[PDB]
Short mmCIF file of C-alpha atoms and ligand atoms in Angstrom, two decimals:
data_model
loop_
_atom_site.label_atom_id
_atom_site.label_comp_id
_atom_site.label_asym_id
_atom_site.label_seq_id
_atom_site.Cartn_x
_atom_site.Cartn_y
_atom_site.Cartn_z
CA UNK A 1 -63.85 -176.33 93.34
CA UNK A 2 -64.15 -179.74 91.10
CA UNK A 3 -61.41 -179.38 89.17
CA UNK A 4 -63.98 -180.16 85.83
CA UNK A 5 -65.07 -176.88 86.17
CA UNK A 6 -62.37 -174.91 87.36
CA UNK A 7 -60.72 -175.90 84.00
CA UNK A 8 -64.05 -175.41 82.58
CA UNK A 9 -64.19 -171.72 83.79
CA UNK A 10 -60.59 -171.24 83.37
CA UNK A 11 -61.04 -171.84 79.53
CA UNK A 12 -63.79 -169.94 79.20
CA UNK A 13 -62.03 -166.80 80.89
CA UNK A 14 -59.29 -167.32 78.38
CA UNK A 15 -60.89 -168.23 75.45
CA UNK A 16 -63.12 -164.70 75.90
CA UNK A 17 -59.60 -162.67 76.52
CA UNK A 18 -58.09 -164.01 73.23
CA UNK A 19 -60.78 -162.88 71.59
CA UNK A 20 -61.19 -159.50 73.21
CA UNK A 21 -57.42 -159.06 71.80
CA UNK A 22 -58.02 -159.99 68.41
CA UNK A 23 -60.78 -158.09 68.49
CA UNK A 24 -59.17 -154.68 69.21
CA UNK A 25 -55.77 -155.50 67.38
CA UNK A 26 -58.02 -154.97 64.34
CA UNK A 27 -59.98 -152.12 65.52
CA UNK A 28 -56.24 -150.84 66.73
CA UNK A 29 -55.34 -150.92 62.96
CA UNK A 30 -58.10 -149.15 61.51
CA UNK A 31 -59.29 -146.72 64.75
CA UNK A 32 -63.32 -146.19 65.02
CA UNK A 33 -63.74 -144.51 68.27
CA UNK A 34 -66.91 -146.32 68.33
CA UNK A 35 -66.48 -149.95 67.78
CA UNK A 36 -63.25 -149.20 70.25
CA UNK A 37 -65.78 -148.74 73.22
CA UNK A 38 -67.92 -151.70 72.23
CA UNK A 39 -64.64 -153.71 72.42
CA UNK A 40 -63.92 -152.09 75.71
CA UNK A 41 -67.20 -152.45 76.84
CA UNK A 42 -66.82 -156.33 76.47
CA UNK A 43 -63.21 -156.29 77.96
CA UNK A 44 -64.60 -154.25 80.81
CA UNK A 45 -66.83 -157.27 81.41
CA UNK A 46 -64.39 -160.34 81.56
CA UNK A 47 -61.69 -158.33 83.92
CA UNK A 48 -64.25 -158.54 86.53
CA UNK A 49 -63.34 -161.96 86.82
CA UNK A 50 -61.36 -163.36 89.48
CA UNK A 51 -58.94 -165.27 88.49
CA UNK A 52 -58.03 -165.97 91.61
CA UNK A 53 -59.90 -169.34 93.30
CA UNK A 54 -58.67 -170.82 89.17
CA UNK A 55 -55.58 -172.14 89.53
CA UNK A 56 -56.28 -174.45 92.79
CA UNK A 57 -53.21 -176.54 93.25
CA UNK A 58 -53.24 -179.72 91.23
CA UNK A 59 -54.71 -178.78 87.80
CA UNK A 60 -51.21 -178.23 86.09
CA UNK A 61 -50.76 -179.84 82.76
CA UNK A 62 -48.63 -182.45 84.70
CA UNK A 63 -51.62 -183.47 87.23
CA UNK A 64 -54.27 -183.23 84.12
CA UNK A 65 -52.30 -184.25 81.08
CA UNK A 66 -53.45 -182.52 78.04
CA UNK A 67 -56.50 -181.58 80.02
CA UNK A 68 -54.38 -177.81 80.83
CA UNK A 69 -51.48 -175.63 79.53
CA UNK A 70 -50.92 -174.55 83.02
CA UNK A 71 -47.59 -174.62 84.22
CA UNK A 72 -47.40 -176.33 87.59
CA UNK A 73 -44.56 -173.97 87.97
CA UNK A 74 -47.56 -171.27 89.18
CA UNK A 75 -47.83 -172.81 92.26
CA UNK A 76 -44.21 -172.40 93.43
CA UNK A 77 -44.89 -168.96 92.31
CA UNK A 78 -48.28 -167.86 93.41
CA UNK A 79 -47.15 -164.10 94.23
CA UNK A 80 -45.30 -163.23 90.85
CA UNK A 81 -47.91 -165.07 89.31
CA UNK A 82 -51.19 -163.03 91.09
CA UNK A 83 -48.55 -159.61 90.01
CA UNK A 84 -48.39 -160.44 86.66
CA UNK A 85 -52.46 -161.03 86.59
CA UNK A 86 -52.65 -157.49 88.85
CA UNK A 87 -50.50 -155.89 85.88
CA UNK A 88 -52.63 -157.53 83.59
CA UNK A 89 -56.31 -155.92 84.74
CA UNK A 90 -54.27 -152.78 85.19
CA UNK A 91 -53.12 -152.48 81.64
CA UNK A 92 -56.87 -153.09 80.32
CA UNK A 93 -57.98 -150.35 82.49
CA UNK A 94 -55.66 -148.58 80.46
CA UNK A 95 -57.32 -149.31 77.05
CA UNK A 96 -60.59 -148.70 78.13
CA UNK A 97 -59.96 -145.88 79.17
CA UNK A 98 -58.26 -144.52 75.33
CA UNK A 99 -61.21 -146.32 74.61
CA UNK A 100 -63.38 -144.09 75.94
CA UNK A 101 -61.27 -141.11 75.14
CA UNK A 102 -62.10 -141.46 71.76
CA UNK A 103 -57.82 -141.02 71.65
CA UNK A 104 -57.05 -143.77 68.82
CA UNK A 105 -52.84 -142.86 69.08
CA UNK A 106 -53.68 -143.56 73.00
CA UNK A 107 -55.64 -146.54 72.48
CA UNK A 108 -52.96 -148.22 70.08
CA UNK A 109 -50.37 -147.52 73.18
CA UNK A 110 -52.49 -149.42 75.67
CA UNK A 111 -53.09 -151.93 73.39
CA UNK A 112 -49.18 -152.94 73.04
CA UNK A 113 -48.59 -152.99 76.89
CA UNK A 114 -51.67 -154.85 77.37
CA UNK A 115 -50.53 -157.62 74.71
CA UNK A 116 -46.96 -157.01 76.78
CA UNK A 117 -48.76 -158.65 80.00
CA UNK A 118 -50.24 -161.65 78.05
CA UNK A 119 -46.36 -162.31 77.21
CA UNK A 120 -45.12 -161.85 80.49
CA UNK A 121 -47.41 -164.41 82.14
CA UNK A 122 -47.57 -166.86 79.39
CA UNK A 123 -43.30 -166.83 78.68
CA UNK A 124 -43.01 -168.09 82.50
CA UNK A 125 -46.50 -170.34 83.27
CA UNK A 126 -48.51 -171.67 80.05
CA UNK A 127 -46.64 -174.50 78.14
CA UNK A 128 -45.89 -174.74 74.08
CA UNK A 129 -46.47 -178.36 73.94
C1 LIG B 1 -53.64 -160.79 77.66
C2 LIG B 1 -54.89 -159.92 77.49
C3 LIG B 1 -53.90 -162.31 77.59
C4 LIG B 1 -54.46 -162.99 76.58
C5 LIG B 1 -54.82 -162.36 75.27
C6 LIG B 1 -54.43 -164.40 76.91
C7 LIG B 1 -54.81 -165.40 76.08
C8 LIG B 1 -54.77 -166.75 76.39
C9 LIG B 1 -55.21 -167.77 75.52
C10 LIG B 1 -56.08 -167.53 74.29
C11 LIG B 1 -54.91 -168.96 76.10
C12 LIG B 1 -55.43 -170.24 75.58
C13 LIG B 1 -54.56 -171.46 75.49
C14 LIG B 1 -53.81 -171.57 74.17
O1 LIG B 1 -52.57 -171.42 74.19
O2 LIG B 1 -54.47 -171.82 73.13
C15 LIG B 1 -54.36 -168.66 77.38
C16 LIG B 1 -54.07 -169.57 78.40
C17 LIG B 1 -53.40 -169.26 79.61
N1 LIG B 1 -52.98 -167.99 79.97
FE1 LIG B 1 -53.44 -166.36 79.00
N2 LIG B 1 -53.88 -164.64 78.13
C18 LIG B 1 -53.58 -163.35 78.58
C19 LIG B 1 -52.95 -163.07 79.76
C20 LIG B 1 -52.47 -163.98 80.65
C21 LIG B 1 -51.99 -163.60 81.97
C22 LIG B 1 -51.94 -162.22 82.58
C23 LIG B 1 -51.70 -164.75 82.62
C24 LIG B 1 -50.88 -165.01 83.92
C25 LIG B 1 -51.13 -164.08 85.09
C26 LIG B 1 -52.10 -165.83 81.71
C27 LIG B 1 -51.85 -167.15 81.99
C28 LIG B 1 -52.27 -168.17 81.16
C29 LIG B 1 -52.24 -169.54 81.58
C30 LIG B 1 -51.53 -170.10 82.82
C31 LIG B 1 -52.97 -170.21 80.61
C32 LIG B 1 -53.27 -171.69 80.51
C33 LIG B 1 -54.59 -172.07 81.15
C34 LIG B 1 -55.01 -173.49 80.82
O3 LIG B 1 -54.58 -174.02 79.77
O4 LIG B 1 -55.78 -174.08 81.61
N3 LIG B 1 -52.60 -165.36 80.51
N4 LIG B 1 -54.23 -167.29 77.54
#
C-alpha cells in the first residue's frame, strides 16, 4: 500500500524482532524456563506477521533515500529472499518450542540458528550505510 506505511509497518515488524532477540540472548545466558516462555510468547506473536505485501517494489533505500535499509537488490531476488524469511519463522518455531520445553541447553541451540537467519538475510539485502 502507500509506501508511508509500508515502511511504517516494516519498521515496526523489525524494531519488535530486535528486541525479541535481545530479549532472549539474555534470558539465553542466564536460563529461567519461565521468563523463556514469556519471551516466546511475544515472539510467537510478531511471526504471525506477513512479511510478505512489505517489500512492494520501489521502497529500496535507493527509491527512499535514508527513508529504508532495504536493499533494492530484494527485488531481483524475491524467491531467495521469501526462503530466507520461510527459514526465518521456521527457526523461531524452533525456540518456542525449547521454550516451552522448559529445555534451557535446547533453547540456547535454537537461539544461535535463529540469530543465524537474521545474518543470512541481512549479509545479502539490508545496507551498512
Ligand atoms: C532475526 C530474528 C532478525 C532480527 C533480529 C532482525 C533485526 C532487524 C533490525 C533490528 C533491523 C533494523 C534496522 C537497523 O539496522 O537498525 C532490521 C532491518 C531489516 N531486516 Fe532484519 N532482522 C531479522 C531477520 C531478518 C530476515 C529473515 C530478513 C530477510 C528475509 C531481514 C531483512 C531485513 C531488511 C531487508 C531490513 C531493512 C528494512 C528497512 O530498513 O526498511 N531481517 N532487521
Amino acid at each position: 500500500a502507500d509506501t508511508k506505511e509500508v515502511l511504517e509497518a516494516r519498521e515496526a515488524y523489525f524494531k519488535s524482532l530486535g528486541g525479541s532477540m535481545k530479549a532472549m540472548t539474555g534470558v539465553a545466558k542466564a536460563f529461567d524456563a519461565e521468563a523463556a516462555k514469556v519471551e516466546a510468547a511475544k515472539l510467537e506473536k510478531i511471526l504471525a506477521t506477513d512479511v510478505a505485501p512489505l517489500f512492494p517494489a520501489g521502497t529500496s533505500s535507493t527509491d527512499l533515500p535514508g527513508q529504508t535499509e532495504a536493499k533494492a537488490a530484494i527485488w531481483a531476488n524475491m524467491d531467495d529472499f521469501g526462503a530466507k524469511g520461510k527459514a526465518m519463522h521456521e527457526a523461531g518455531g524452533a525456540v518456542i518450542a525449547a521454550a516451552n520445553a522448559g529445555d534451557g541447553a535446547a533453547f540456547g541451540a535454537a537461539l544461535q540458528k535463529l540469530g543465524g537467519t537474521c545474518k543470512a538475510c541481512h549479509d545479502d539485502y539490508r545496507e551498512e550505510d
